[PDB]
């Protein structure tokens, strides 16, 4: 996260850390959407241009974390992967369309003050909240700048950006499965996701039932906190069908 702030303890209890066994290291952000399922971005697991194709056995899931590098004894919980599920039409070749994957855990994680799942939007919450100017919150342990690593979970609030502005900011072909977020050069304030934040949650708090919803998954950007450029997020409601398919058929 760039120009973000230190997370309060318990502020993001759905935040998950994709962790690399050997060599031990942060792979990506992710989120907890139930006691056995974790949501993340597809490119965190599969990205052939970079020679990335992880399997379950390669990874660990670390839930309830605050500190980036520290092993938070009695607080965090580390889960083993049972199965990985990548969207069958994930477009790593062109624009990262449909950048989303599910990770079924080996054993149920136990909730606590530090561990708790976020909601997934229904059509009516998406329609009410996915609006230019409405702000969301993205979190993660990624770089503090484009060119470093934070000591604790970073937090930043960012306004959803108008689709024409999103499109006019880039040469990449953008889709309905994406939205962009970030301030304009105009708006003075700044901030963005960055490398390592990938697969992490863009959440909003519904003013209707006071619950936090994950609207977006950190997907891509051209640089980090670049003036006139925006963060791009997987549109989770647009792929909710796929998500409950996967969950409705594999337990």
């Amino acid at each position: 996260i760039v120009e973000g702030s230190d997370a309060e303890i318990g502020m993001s209890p759905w935040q998950v850390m994709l962790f690399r066994k050997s060599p031990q290291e942060l792979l990506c952000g992710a989120s907890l959407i139930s006691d056995r399922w974790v949501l993340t971005a597809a490119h965190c697991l599969l990205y052939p241009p970079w020679d990335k194709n992880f399997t379950e056995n390669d990874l660990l899931v670390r839930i309830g974390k605050h500190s980036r590098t520290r092993y938070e004894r009695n607080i965090e919980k580390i889960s083993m992967l049972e199965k990985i599920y990548i969207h069958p039409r994930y477009n790593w070749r062109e624009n990262l369309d449909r950048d989303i994957a599910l990770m079924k855990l080996k054993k149920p994680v136990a909730f606590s003050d530090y561990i708790h799942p976020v909601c997934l939007p229904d059509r009516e919450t998406a329609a009410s909240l996915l609006q230019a100017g409405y702000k969301g919150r993205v979190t993660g342990w990624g770089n503090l700048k484009e060119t470093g690593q934070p000591s604790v979970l970073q937090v930043v609030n960012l306004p959803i950006v108008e689709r024409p502005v999103c499109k006019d900011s880039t040469r990449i072909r953008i889709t309905d499965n994406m939205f962009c977020a970030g301030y304009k050069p105009d708006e003075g304030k700044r901030g963005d996701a960055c490398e390592g934040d990938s697969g992490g949650p863009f959440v909003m708090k519904s003013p209707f039932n006071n619950r936090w919803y994950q609207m977006g998954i950190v997907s891509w950007g051209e640089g980090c906190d670049r003036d006139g450029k925006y963060g791009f997020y997987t549109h989770v409601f647009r792929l909710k069908k796929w998500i409950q398919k996967v969950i409705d058929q594999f337990g």
């Binding site: 962790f19 066994k21 031990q24 290291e25 590098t69 092993y71």
Partner: peptide, 10 residues
């Protein structure tokens, strides 16, 4: 740079 996770969990 990462603190060692317990040998278990693998």
């Amino acid at each position: 740079d990462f603190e060692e996770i317990p040998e278990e969990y693998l």
